[PDB]
Each structure stands twice: as structure tokens, then as C-alpha cells.
Amino acid sequence: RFSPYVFNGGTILAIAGEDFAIVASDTRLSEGFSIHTRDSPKCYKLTDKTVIGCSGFHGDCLTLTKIIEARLKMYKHSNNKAMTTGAIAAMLSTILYSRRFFPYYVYNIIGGLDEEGKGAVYSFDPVGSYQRDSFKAGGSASAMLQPLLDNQVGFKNMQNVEHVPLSLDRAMRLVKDVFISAAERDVYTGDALRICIVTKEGIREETVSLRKD
Amino acid sequence: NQYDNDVTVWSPQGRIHQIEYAMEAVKQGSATVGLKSKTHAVLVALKRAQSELAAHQKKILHVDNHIGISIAGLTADARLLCNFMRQECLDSRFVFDRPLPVSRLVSLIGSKTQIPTQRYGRRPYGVGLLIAGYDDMGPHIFQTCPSANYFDCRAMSIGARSQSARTYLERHMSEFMECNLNELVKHGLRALRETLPAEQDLTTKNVSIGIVGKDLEFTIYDDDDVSPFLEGLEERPQ
Amino acid sequence: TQNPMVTGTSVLGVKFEGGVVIAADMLGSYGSLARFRNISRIMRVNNSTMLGASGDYADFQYLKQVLGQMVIDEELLGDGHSYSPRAIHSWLTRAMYSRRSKMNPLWNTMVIGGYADGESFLGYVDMLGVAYEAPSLATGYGAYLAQPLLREVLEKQPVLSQTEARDLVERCMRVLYYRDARSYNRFQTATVTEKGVEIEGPLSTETNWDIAHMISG
Amino acid sequence: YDRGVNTFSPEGRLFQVEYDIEAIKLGSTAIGIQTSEGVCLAVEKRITSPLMEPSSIEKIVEIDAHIGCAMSGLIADAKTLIDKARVETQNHWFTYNETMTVESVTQAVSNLALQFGEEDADPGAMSRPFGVALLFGGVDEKGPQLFHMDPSGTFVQCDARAIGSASEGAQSSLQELYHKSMTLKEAIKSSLIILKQVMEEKLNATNIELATVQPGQNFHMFTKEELEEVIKDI
Amino acid sequence: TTIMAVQFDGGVVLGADSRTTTGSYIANRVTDKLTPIHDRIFCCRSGSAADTQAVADAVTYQLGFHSIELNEPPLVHTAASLFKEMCYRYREDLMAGIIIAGWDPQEGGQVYSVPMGGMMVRQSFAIGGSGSSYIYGYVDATYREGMTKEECLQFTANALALAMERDGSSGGVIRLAAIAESGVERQVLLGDQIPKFAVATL
Amino acid sequence: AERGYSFSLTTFSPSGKLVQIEYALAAVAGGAPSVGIKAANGVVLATEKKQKSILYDERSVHKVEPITKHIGLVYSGMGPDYRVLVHRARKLAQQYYLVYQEPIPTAQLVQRVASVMQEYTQSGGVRPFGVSLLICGWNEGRPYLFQSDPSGAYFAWKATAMGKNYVNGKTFLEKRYNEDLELEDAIHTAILTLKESFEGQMTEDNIEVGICNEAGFRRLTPTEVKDYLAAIA
Amino acid sequence: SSIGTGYDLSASTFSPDGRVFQVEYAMKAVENSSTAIGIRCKDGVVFGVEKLVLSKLYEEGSNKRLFNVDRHVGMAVAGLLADARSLADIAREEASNFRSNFGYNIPLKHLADRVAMYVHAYTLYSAVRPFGCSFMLGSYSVNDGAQLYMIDPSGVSYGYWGCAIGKARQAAKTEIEKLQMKEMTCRDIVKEVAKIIYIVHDEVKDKAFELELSWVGELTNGRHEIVPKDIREEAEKYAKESLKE
Amino acid sequence: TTIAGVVYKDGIVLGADTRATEGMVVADKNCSKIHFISPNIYCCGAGTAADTDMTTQLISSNLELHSLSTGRLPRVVTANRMLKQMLFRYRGYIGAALVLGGVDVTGPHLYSIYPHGSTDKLPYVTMGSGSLAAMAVFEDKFRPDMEEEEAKNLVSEAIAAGIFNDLGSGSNIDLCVISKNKLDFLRPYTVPNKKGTRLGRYRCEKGTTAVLTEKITPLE
Amino acid sequence: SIMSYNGGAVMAMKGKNCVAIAADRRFGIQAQLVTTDFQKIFPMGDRLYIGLAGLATDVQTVAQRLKFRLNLYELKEGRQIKPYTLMSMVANLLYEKRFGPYYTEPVIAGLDPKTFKPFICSLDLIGCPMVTDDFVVSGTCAEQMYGMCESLWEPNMDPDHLFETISQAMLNAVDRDAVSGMGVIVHIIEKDKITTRTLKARMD
Ligand SMILES: [Mg+2]
Ligand SMILES: [Mg+2]
Ligand SMILES: [Mg+2]
Ligand SMILES: [Mg+2]
Ligand SMILES: [Mg+2]
Ligand SMILES: [Mg+2]
Ligand SMILES: [Mg+2]
Ligand SMILES: [Mg+2]
Ligand SMILES: [Mg+2]
Ligand SMILES: [Mg+2]
Ligand SMILES: [Mg+2]
């Protein structure tokens, strides 16, 4: 007949530390058993301290992204200030709910800093249900990345361990590892891995390489 | 007075008083000035305060990254038009992912504000506008009036006693195009000062500046932020 | 459109130094019937952007109608402003997505080719609204037969010349003819450069059938 | 002389909007002052009879925990604007999960500004402006703030402001007493001192409303007693 | 059904069978599938009788007004456009396979095809309808550039004859019509008049 | 682009009168006269078809119109308004028949059209119809004759007149004829009451007449007219 | 004749002597405007306008009184500009819808009759007011040749060889009759257009001014374009020099 | 149902069986299937009885309103147009199959209209479940310009073929002849079906039915 | 099927100068009886009755809405509805729901209000009418009822030989239909009187 949806794959991950937030995603865009492009990162800058990653149906991610952008401009003209990471998250929730009966097939993850300067991460389901987390991943590799983080970043299942804070350095390598391991088992993950780091200084990008197969 | 109350009534002289009256609303508003070099568009305006305990009125508003405006006339109408202008811009970026060409935005204000001037029971928008923007055709300064008419300007000024400012601008036009920002802004501040009673001038409390240009997104300056421009202003009236 | 009728097969697009090139056979299929053998599935959208469409030809004609009016409209203003390749590609994505969201899609996959500001533009657009930019594009079967060749070449030489590129397109348009059962060895080649948009008349490719004589051996 | 409600005068001003500004001058007087430690709002109820419950007269209301508002003029009209405001603050909270600034709230209300007309209009459309003047007092990310808004749709921030019949006089006094460094304690005293002057009746603790909003405490409508306490220092 | 149109210098030739069935029962063996749209413009219809009839009346109405309003002979391309507009717009609710051919003081003789989808394309000669599938090879090997109003008029007679022979959905009598500046002349080919081809034997 | 006046153009004056309605009647009293007679076995309608020049083709237009197979009409007043009401009556006549399968009872058709005429005395943006009608019919044995005027009010008459000299034309009939009059009889006393004002040479093209017996309604031809004219037939 | 006792407030009211004063009043607005002229050469149509210098602060090109209504049709206006511009949008829309429907460029006679009926629609009710403007439509094609039309506030539309609207409608005509356009080429008419403009222009009352020239004919390839600065200057010089005589 | 019409030298003849069925049971042994449009126009209806009624009644009603204004007599193309454009608009949901026939200023016209809205202009047509049976009679014995009686019976012969060969048709054969000056609406034209003569007696004699309650009421 | 949800039977017969109409009395929902005193025949003026079979809700609704129309008709017109006209009135009411019809096939029985003329007819759930000179049936036992009728009806019948005839048709038809019955009621209308009897019948 005609489906108005497609699965393009790609995963998205994010972690929040005392003073930083990280948002990562592979860069492969596929459909069927093919690859549309190897250079299509799912991370996008919303403000100077808020980044969003979208996975699922690219048609919806694109539309959603442009809707968010416009609404921030509106908020700015209206209140004379930029939107705080928390308000953007609250808004995205209602935007997703407006399509409750014809969902945006999309899994979004917001990574940034809260007004208090600390790191923040919000995860959403296609219709707006959300919450804040220390770290979370969505997308195909979703179930591949998570477990390692529950262990490494959450010190779960480990007896007598040192609950040391996620040093931005250790984080950055955890991110690269799970994505490199995932790139090994999920046919959707591969090509490259772009990371976006959000701190008091701004947003900095880094692109690591992945298997092109 | 049979020809004064409805914009659908032409006078035996081929005029529409309601339109003219609305134009009067502009004249009442405090004066504002606009001018552009070949790389920057600048808006300058004088803000008024009801009483001494009240703040000064906004006169410059942000439309989009490449467009800003100054207003004179009914404030409520300014907000209507501003929001229309903002909406039209958001739509451009949404559909075309590019900023709305300033001249095209001006044509829309022209079409939108013309409609009510021709229908019974409706009234002309009661506000004038100086528009400062920057598109792939460079800097621009437009003027729009209660009559759906609009103008492409080298420099301009509307409002109370704006006749002086116009005069000052008409004298130093040739200079504008090659001015560097701060000089361009000064000419603006200088022209505005022309519209004031000799026994008073520009304060960091009553001046507002708007700048957009190849090197900068439309930005507004209001209080301490205005000092940097006021400094180096020859208190040499002329 | 809920059921495509007369359709066009794959469409190719690769960019080179100072321009982009697109290729599309001139076939309008009706199921398995090569029904309309001489129709253009390429269009010139103003001086810096061109478009190629796979899918329902009727819908494509429609887009061609709306896009033509749009360009005309803009030209009337002669205000020194004109849609860029990215702009046309952006609009198309909004359009295709809008229709997909009304459950009444325009059954096309399109390749937008453009050149503006010394940079090359090449964009993809689904009937579902999936859109993206890339150095090489191939829709339909071309995505299984042509894109692997195109990438192969570019992973070893990112920069081609209008000639090196046209050489690749011809090679691909041959592979497509050999393997896509709904292709026609009679295509067009459109090119965009600082000079503009150029479309080349009915072309064909040398085909080699010497393996046919290897039945027994 | 009969013309449309959206007609301009030769002076470039809408007759209706001018004619309602006039109506405000017939309302009771209210004062609002803004201090770094909070904002206060005071208004004379202007009781017209002993048989009328002084309490069933609210010229000062809560918009939201961080925002209070005082009115003057055709109070029936203010009912509507007040509700739109409360509803607006909640839509903002619903959508963005954060409180709305005092400026944005005032602005939201101001957009219903000249939203009146006859022809080319919906059925549930206003046919005339609201004959009301308002004072939005509250505290937000930018500290304590006071805003004034009249029927023209214009609104602005004020360190201190007065509306109503005694407005002219009241504002004169406020200009004499305001200190960029005074306090919420000093502020409230001035308000009542001035309010006492302008009122035609002797200032009772039952013929005035006083409320404050401070960086810590959420909107508070002074009690009959708390008034006695401040009035004690006539 | 089997419809066909050919372009020759100063005009066009149009042909169609006369069979219209509902299932396997012929409800009309003498149908007139060539409909006049305007003084010198005709269309051949295939598909839903109700749809093609309803659409043609609509275009005739549309075109008749357009010409009086311009006080000029309408373009053949315009008539094609009006069919294409309705057939594209309501493509999901119509089952119409149309061919528009006629004479234009400005473009001369022309033939346009507007198949199921709603697309429109100009052609030297066009064929449509169920029976059309059996005469492609024929028509491809027989069409000659430069034929005469006579060669053409005979060329479609053969194609329609062949097609009518093999397609159950086609048959009856062959109707023709030639249009050129001078005007329009319509003829019919009953029984024997219909080209014949010997059925292969021993 | 057009809007519409939603306020009524007819309104009570302090005298309690509905001015526009009176004035409408004035347009009536100033129109070509019409006579209607209920002969207890068929009704007759006749009016003065005064055409200016001889250039007018008396044929092309009629004033005595058939509503249904058994109903008929004539008016006194503004011709264009009439025409409107004729199309609406004929229409009302069909909406009845489709539902009931029985031709519409004359009294019922009158009621329905009267309601329309009344509508134009209260609805916004309009003026009352400047016309008065005389409806005649054979519904269920008995013949009927009615008159409805601008106000939308109607009455049943044994016979009457409207238009110029309707005052004299009435009084004349108020005696110059009575019930029990058979067919052709009522027709004569009708064309006569007409001449009681018809200034000029009342010929077979200066008048038009229709009759409604319990066997359908029809218009009489110039022949049957030229006849009755010779003071008999 | 001073008629106007309520009989001149609504377009939906006839005066006791059969006139619609609102429309007449709208025309005055036009008679007070600056002159614009159109002349059908043998291979196209040429447009010229006396665009008065409102202020030296305005850019050259501000308040243009000539627009492209379709790629093959030009529009020259006089009167209330804002009214004219909306009529230009309508013309454009009309020409665009036509192509979408019938599939070919709109015939100038039709685009003119269409817009004219839209203008006329505004002279029947109290709900709206007549456009205070007049305009000319010019086009060229090989199958239609050159065509020049002019519509006014009443809706009336006609074809011309030459025509003028504005302050000096009359003065401009007596000068156009001196040319034999029917045989003249567009490239030569530019000069004559600019000529008739300076003649008619009032050096006294109306201060400084600018000249706007429109192009459309075999010389432009059917596309209505602005006249090249080069041709304009030449035509300005010729006009100025011919003035000193 | 079997309905048919033929075009002969002086005019037109319409035929029609008279059976109506609710499933495979006969509800009406005498349904009137030839409907009146105008005095010179008649229409036979097959399909959904109710639909055949109301559409036929509406077009009739609309034509009486039409000729009541033009002052002229209705044309067949007009009935054909009105009918087809309505049916088409309902995409087949108004199940009306019609055989339209009448005489114009332009002559006798015979059209066949299908529920989806297409029409056929033909010298002889049939509709209904018995249409193939009837059409056989025509195809085998049809001649142009037949005389009234020579057609008037070809039609009763085709409506007969239907009646016996189609379980959906039975009872009487009604006819309708319309010529430049005549309109013979022959209701029973033929009656080739009679209920078999009752061979026994069952008359219920007063008192045989036991009653449980009685109650009378006098009228006036 | 929807029609046989509540079950039911209705019949009308034509005598010389009289008319009869009877109906079972059961009101059930599938297999289960719910009521024994269910009205299915409604008075629509003196000497005019309508009998409704089919789906219980629409029976009640079609009747109530028909009364609505019948009353006004009689208040506007200055008379009492004529049978052929009430039939056309119901034919209109039902067809206004052509694409979402009421599930009931009515039966009309009566005498001309100003004449002897006996009149009977039945209709489609969509308003197609049928008039006959003998009888008409409606309900879940159309077949059984036709059986009796084609074997018991005689051209002319006095009120009593009509009552005994229609009473036998019902009771016997209704006794070979599982969802019709629980008692039968008969109405015999004569220019002078209205005899209403509830026959003795099975209650299973
Ligand atoms: Mg589908
Ligand atoms: Mg990307
Ligand atoms: Mg792989
Ligand atoms: Mg008269
Ligand atoms: Mg006019
Ligand atoms: Mg000259
Ligand atoms: Mg030119
Ligand atoms: Mg049978
Ligand atoms: Mg009774
Ligand atoms: Mg039972
Ligand atoms: Mg039981």
C-alpha cells in the first residue's frame, strides 16, 4: 500500500558529568540493506549549551529539527532570552505529543548544561515521554551500548569499587569504546562517530573513525 | 466631515483622510533614524518615558538574524507587524533554509497593510517603520507607512521633528557608503540629535541603536551598551 | 498518488570540479511495458540547479509545473535574488514531507544537481521526505548497481573532472542497462557549471554481448 | 456623529482607545512600587455602602505565586484580562516547565490590546477596548518588577506608578518619595501615606488592599491585621 | 477497447473500435468512442465509460467557454491540458485512458496521450486501451514518418483490425475521423470493409 | 468582494406602521389592474397587459403564469418581483409533490409563498416584494381564489381586483356580479370589470386571461380572447 | 455640477443623474498622479514614467511604477501606488493560474479582461472602495504581435497604439499623435518616450524627477525587461537636447 | 427484471416485466416499472426499486419545473443529462439502471443509463437480470423503421423472453408507445401468467379462531 | 442479520369495505423473550393504522418521528391524512436515511377518510412502497406468511370472514418461526367501528 515511515538506523548516546555533557552518534544513514550516506551525524546544536541527537526515521528527524529551531527563535523574540536546556526538553515533549495519533518515529536525546552550570541529559520516546538521566543511548545500538555504561559509569554489579566521578577524559573514551564495539555487531552502526562536547566554554566537536562495513 | 471616517470613502479630491490621519500617528511617535554604509545597516532611535519613574519605550525590535526594525506610531500595531514580519521570516528558513530577502519581506508588509485600507470597517495600520537588514544584495534601509506604500532608502528618519534629521542626512549622504561602522553610527546619532530642543541632547538613557551588517547579526544596544557610541560625539551642535 | 502508473527507473548524480552531472534514461514504463520511450525525466530549475526524477512521471510533471512557476515568479521580481541549489532541495524536502504526512505522496525519488559559489551541490529527496547531501547519488536499481561503482572511484580519488565524471556515468548507465530490467539504453546527461545547465540529447552506450557465445564452454 | 470603532481622529489616535483612557480616570486609585527586596501594590476599594461586604471587592489579585496585579477602571472588564493572564502563565508552565517573567505576562495581556472591531470579525470578538489600567507586580529571574499597562496596549516598567482618579497627584508624591535604594518596608509606608492623601474617605484598614511579592515570599495579600500594623504609623 | 491517433502534415487521423463490455457481455457493440471536444478537437476514450463520458463533457464545457471568452479557435494543447488537469487531480477516482488529437491553426495537427496516471505527452501517433498491447510490435514496425492522411487513415485501420482480432475487450466496427484545417470527416468500416488477415492453416 | 446587510430594512414607526410595506402596496395600487372571480365551478384571472409601443412582442412574456398543472397566477405591481415569486411558487409546488405524491393544495401553496413574502419584511438587507398575487386553483372539488400581498398576509376571495381603480373595480363587482355564475359567465363579468378602467382600445393583445376549472388550469389563446371580447363568445 | 449630498459616499449608490461619484473620485486620485505613457511600436510596446523625486534620500528604483506581471507582460501604473501594487499581485496571480490551468502563457487581452473584472468588482458595493489607480499592460510575441491595454478605476479596458495616464493625460497624447508608431521600431521609440516625458513634465511645480523605461518586443525576445541603462541615457540626452528647441 | 426499448418509424416502445423480489421470493407480482418523466418522455427502471423511483421522480419533477419556464416541451438529452450527471456523482451507490425513451422536436430518442453514470444512444436496449434474454430477441428479430405493431410486439416478445428465462423476472408485460402525436401507456399489455385454479376449500368459518380479548370503538 | 434481531411479524389484508392488520407481540433479543406486550401497530388517525416490523428501536423511532410529521401535516392542512398520502410520507422519511436506513419495513392499512376505499401497502427499509388489493407481509416469516395468504385469501370478505382469515394466516405462520409469536393482535377497521382482539396463541 504505502507506509509513511522508514527506518534509517543510527544510534545516539549522551552522558552528563559534573560540568559537561556529551552527545554522540554514528554517522551512517541507511535504508533496507543499503547505505544512503556515510556522513550523516545525528547531532545538532540548538543553543550555546544545548545539543540534540535524533535517530529513527530521518524524514521526521529533519522536520522535527526545523520545528525546534523555529520555536526557539519564537521563544527568544517573546521572552528576550534563550531557552534553558530544561525548557527545551519540556517543549520537545509537547511537540512530540501533538502527533500522538500519527507519531514522529523518532528517538531524541538532549545533551547540555542546566542553569546551575552542571551537565544534563534528557531522553525521549517518540511521543514525548521523557526524563533526565546520567547517561542514555537510543537507536539501534541502544541495547548494545547501555549495559557497558551501567557497569562502567554506574558501577553496577561491581563490589568494592571506587565511585570516582566521570572525568571528561574517561567519558570521552567510554563513548568511543561502546560505539567501536557496537560498530562490530550492529550493521547500522559504522563509518564514523561524531561527538559533541558541551561545557562552560561552549560546544566542541570530534570525529572518530569506524568500520565502513 | 462626511469624508473623514471610513477608509472606503474617497474625498472629492482623490484622497483618503483615514489614511492621512493614520500617517499622523507616525509623526507623533518619537523620532528615529536609519542609514547604511555599503556593509552595515544602522537604526538609531530616541526613546520616551511617560514619567520619570517609568522606563523608556522600546523603539528597536529584532525580527530575524539579518533584520531588525525601529517603530513610530501605535505600539500595538508595531507588535502586530513585527510578529507578522517574524513569522514570515521563520517560514522562509523552514521551507527554503535561507534568510528571507529583505526586499521580499518589505513587499509582504506592503501587501498586508494595503488590504485593510480598502475594506469597509477596517482601519489602516497606525505605524511607520524603518527596516534595517542585510541580504545577499548588501545592507538595506526601508521605510513603510500607514498607507501600504514603502521606500528603499539611502538613509531616513520618521517621527516628531524628523524633518531636521532628514535634512542632516541629506547633507552627509555621500559620506555614508564609505563610513566605517562607528562613523556611520555617529552620523545616525548626530542626525537624531537634530530633532531635539537645543537645551538637551542624547543620553545613554534615551538612545537605542540597532546594527546589522556583513560582519554582524542584527544586534540592539540600550543603556551602558550605548556609551561606546556616545563617546567621541562632538557636543558641537550644527 | 497511491498507485504509481507510468514510471521512470533509476537516476544518477555525481559532482566534479566546477559542476555536477546527472543522468536518467528516457523511459516511461507502465509495469513491465516500455511504453513511452522518448520522455525527459530531467528538468532545468533556473540557471544554477537541475533536477532528475525517478518514479511516477505524472507526479514529476506536477513538481515540474510548480517549480517552473516558482522560478518564473522569482524572475519577475528581478530583485537580484534567486533560489540556490540548497534552497530548491530544501523546498522539495518540505513538499515531499508535507504530502507524505497527508498520506498522499508524490511517488518520486529525486536528485537535485547544482552549482553556486564555486561549490557543487548534490541532493537526494524521498517521497517520504528523507533528504541528504552527498558527492554521488543513485536511486532505484542504480543504488545497487551504480552507487557501488561511483563510491569505489571516489574512495580513491575524491576529485573528478567534468570528463572523468562523464566517463563514470557512461560506465554506470551501461551496467544499469545490463541489469535493470526496466531501463532503456537511451538517456540524457545534464550538467551544471558556472556556465549554467546543459541537457544532452538522446545518448546510448556501447554494449558488449560477447559472453553470449559462451553457452557450452 | 456615528463612526466605526476603528476610526482615527485627525490627530492620529483611535477615538475608542482615547475614550477608554478617559474611563480609567473614573476608577479608584492604586499604587505600585518596586524595591530590590520586593514589590507592593495598594488600592482604595472605594466602598460605597456599609451594607456592602468590603471583602467582596478585589482590585488586587494573584496571577501566579510570583505575580500579583492591581486594577482600576471598569472592573467588570478587568475580569477577562486577569483570567487570560492566569491562563497564559499556566500554558507557559505547561509547555516549558518554568515560570513566566513578569514582562512576558504583561506583554501577553497587551496583545489583546486593540483586538476589537466590527466588520471582518469573528462572532466572539470584542466590540470595544477594555476600560482598564493595570499594574503587574512580581519577581522573576530579573529580580522584583513592576509594569504598567493601559488600553492603548502600551506597557512599560516603572520603579513606582499610580493609576486611577488621583493618579496625577499620587504620581507627584511618588516622585518626591522614591529612592532607588529604599526598602519594601519604606515602600509600603509611602504607598499608604499617599493613598491616604488622595482618598476622599478616611483611610481604614477595611477600605484598602495591600499586597507584596518578594524575592523569597510568594505573593501575599495583607490581612486585616497586618494593615492595622502598618496603618498604626499613619 | 483499442484507440489510436496519428499525426500527418495538415491534420490528424483517429480510430477506435466500438466494443464496450461489462465482464464478458457486450453492452454495446456499436459504441462511438471518438468524442468531439470542440470544432476541430477530438478525444478517444478507453476505461470507465462513466468516467470518460463525464470527463469529456466537463472539458467540452471548459473549452467552449475559454474560446468564446477569447473569441478564437482553442489550442489542441489546451484541450489536452484540461483533460490532464482533471485526470491528474482525480487520478485516484478515475479510470480513463485518453488520447487527444485535433488541428490547431497555430500548431497544426497534434496528438497527445493522457494515460491512467494523469501524465501528458505529445506523440507522432498514440495507442491506448486493452487491445493496444497486441499492436505495439506491429505499429513499431509499420509506422513511417511522412505518411499521408490516406496512408495514416489506412495504417490505423490495420492496427485496429489486428487488435480487434486478438482482444476480447475489443471488436465491433472501426470508426475513423480525420481532422485538418478544412474540417472533420468521420467514416465507419463495417464487416467486410474491415481489413482482414487469413487465420494460419496447414 | 461583497459582505451583506444583516439588519432589517423594514421597521415599525411610532404610529406602529410598517412603512416599507405600505409603500410596497403603493407600488401595487399603481400597477396594471387585475381581477379574479370564483365561479363555484372554476376561477378566472385577467389583467391589463398594456404594452407601450406596438414594437413589444406581447407573446414573449406572460403575467398569467401556471404554477402547477392545476394552479395559476396573476399579479399587480412590480413585474420583476413577480417573476421571482413565480419561480419560488413553482419550486415550492414541486417540493410538496415529491414528498406527498399529491398535487399541492391551493391553500397550502398560498401559505408557503406568503411565508416567503413575509420573510422579505424582516430579513436583513432587503425590501418587501412590491407585488400582490391572485392564486387560483381546483383542489378537491371546490375552486379557490386567494390574494397575498407584500406583508405576507393572504385572504380568500369570491372575487376581487388589485392595481389601478381596484377600489372601483371591487365595488363594481361588489354588485355587478355574484355567486352561482357559471364558467363563461364569470369570464365575461371579469373582462367587463376590467374595462371599467381599461383606458384605450381593449383588444385581444391588451389583455391576457387564464381560467382554472376542476380539470386543470390554463391560459386562453388570443382567439378565445378575441371572441369573449365581442361582448359575448 | 456640484452633486454630492450623500450620493457620493458609497460605490453602491447612483447619483440622481446616473453617476457613481466614488469611482469618479478614485479617478481624480489618478489625475493627480505623475504621468506615465505607453506606446505600441511595430515590434513591441514601450513604457515610460515621470517618477517624481519624492526625496533625495530615496534610492533610484524606489517606488517603481513599472512591474513584470508575467515574463511577457509589463505593467505601468499611475495613482495610489499601494493600490496599484496589489493590482500587480492580482495580475501576476491571474497570469500564473492561467498557465497552471490551460498550460501556456496568458494572452494579454485575457489577462487584461480578467484583472479589469476584478477592478470592476470593487465599484459595486459599499463594502469596499474603487482602486485609485490606472495601469497599462504591454506585451509582445510573434503569434500575437505587440499589444497595449489600459484599465482604469471603473474596470473599463481597451487596446491602444499609444496612451497616457496621470497629471498630463491630455498633453501627452497630443505629443504621441505626432509619431507614427505603427511603422516605428521599439529601439527608436525609447527616445520618443523620454521625449514626450520631458515636454509634458512641469519644470516649475513638480521638482526634479527620474525616468523609468520598460522593454518588451522582438528586441527583448518576448521577455519584458527594463531598458538598458545605455539606451536610457541616450534617450535622456536626446530628450534633453530636443528640449532646448 | 427485464426492461427494454426500441426505436421504430414513428416513435418509441418501452417494455418491462412486473415482478419485484425480496431475495428469491416474489414480493410484488405487479410492480410498475415504466415511469413517467414528461408527457413525451418515459423511463423504465431496473435495480434498487427505491432508487429507480426517487431518481426517476426527481428528474421528472425537475423537468416539469424546466419546461414550466422555457414554455417549450422537454427534450430527451436533457433527461439523459440530468440523470447521468446525478448517478455519476454518486459513483454507483444509487443503483439505478434506466431505459430512457421519448420524442423530441428532434425526434424519438432511446438512451440506456447505467448506475455509474454512463449512457448509450441506441436503436434498441435492455437492462436488468433478464436483459440478456431480451437482447437475444432484439438481435435476432430487429428491423429499423418497424411499424408500431411490428415493434409493439417485438418488445413484448423480448420482455417475454426475460419473464420465462430469468428467475428475477415474471408476471405481466407492460408497454409504452410514444410517437410524434401519441402516447399509449398500455399497462397490462400481455398477461402470460395466471395463478393456478384453487383445487380445494379453506375459507375460515366465523368462530374457528379462539379469541382472548375484544374491544370495539364506534366512528362517525 | 440485523432485521431478525428482535424478530417479529406484521400483516395487512383487504376486505370489501373493511381492512385488517395484525402483529405478533413478542419483543426479544435473539433467543430470549423480554416482553409479551410489545406494540408494533400504531394508530395514525381513525381508520388508518401503520404496522412496523423489524428492529425494535427503529420501530419505535420510525413511528414516533412519523407521528411528529403526521400531526403537523394535519395542523397545516385542514384535514385528516389520506392513506396513499401517509404511505408517501413514510416513503420520504425512510429514504432520507438511504445510506444509513432505519431497519423496519412498514405495513399500512386503512380506509379513505372521505370514502369507502380500503387501502393496504408495505415498504422497503429505504422507502420503496408496494400497494396490493389482497395482502402484504413483513417480518422474519415473510415466507410462512405468504404461504397462508396465497391459500386463504378470498376477493371479497365481510369483517368476520376477514378476521377469521387474517387470524389464521398469522397464528399458523408465526408458529413456524422461532422468533415471532408470544401472542397475536388483530385490528379490523370498518367505516363504523374498530374491533381489536388479541387472539389465543402459543407462548413458546
Ligand atoms: Mg497507498
Ligand atoms: Mg548529519
Ligand atoms: Mg556492509
Ligand atoms: Mg398587473
Ligand atoms: Mg464600473
Ligand atoms: Mg516625441
Ligand atoms: Mg518595451
Ligand atoms: Mg422467470
Ligand atoms: Mg380509527
Ligand atoms: Mg414462535
Ligand atoms: Mg420458545
Curated annotation (Swiss-Prot), chain I:
Described purpose of this protein according to its UniProt entry: Non-catalytic component of the 20S core proteasome complex involved in the proteolytic degradation of most intracellular proteins. This complex plays numerous essential roles within the cell by associating with different regulatory particles. Associated with two 19S regulatory particles, forms the 26S proteasome and thus participates in the ATP-dependent degradation of ubiquitinated proteins.
Modified positions (N6-acetyllysine) in chain numbering: K76
Alphabetical list of InterPro entries matching this protein: Ntn_hydrolases_N, Proteasome_beta_3, Proteasome_bsu_CS, Proteasome_sua/b, Proteasome_suB-type
Subunit structure: The 26S proteasome consists of a 20S proteasome core and two 19S regulatory subunits. The 20S proteasome core is a barrel-shaped complex made of 28 subunits that are arranged in four stacked rings. The two outer rings are each formed by seven alpha subunits, and the two inner rings are formed by seven beta subunits. The proteolytic activity is exerted by three beta-subunits PSMB5, PSMB6 and PSMB7.
Pfam families, per the entry: Proteasome
Family: Belongs to the peptidase T1B family.
Keyword annotations from UniProtKB, A to Z: Acetylation, Cytoplasm, Nucleus, Proteasome
Subcellular location: Cytoplasm; Nucleus
Name assigned to this protein: Proteasome subunit beta type-3
Any single Gene Ontology cellular-component annotation: proteasome core complex, beta-subunit complex
